[PDB]
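Quick start: load a record and inspect it. Here is DNA ligase 4:
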Amino acid sequence: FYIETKLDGERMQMHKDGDVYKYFSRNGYNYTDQFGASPTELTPFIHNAFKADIQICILDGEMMAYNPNTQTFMQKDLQTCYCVFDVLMVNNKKLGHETLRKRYEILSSIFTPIPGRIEIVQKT
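Running the structure step on this input writes:
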């Protein structure tokens, strides 16, 4: 059977171009100083799980913190995790025309998750 879970966190966006990435808030703001602009530097980690020909990408999501030993998201110290529910542009291709159906499905195409640091979720 199945259990569903309503969660919320800090809405952020990620831009990706070939090892150089940027971090934008809801309002927009540069949070690249919190997470990081390259793999050497709060989520270097995520850097390599990406499919091949993906080089440039935009991904909408919301930023969560989880507890490793408890394997759950604390929503009431720990580690930062990005739960990504959408994609806008990737590999030159900005498709906002496609239904969110299509963009979520496509999301499987972009990456592969690390659990507890960057999973994937539904906006529903």
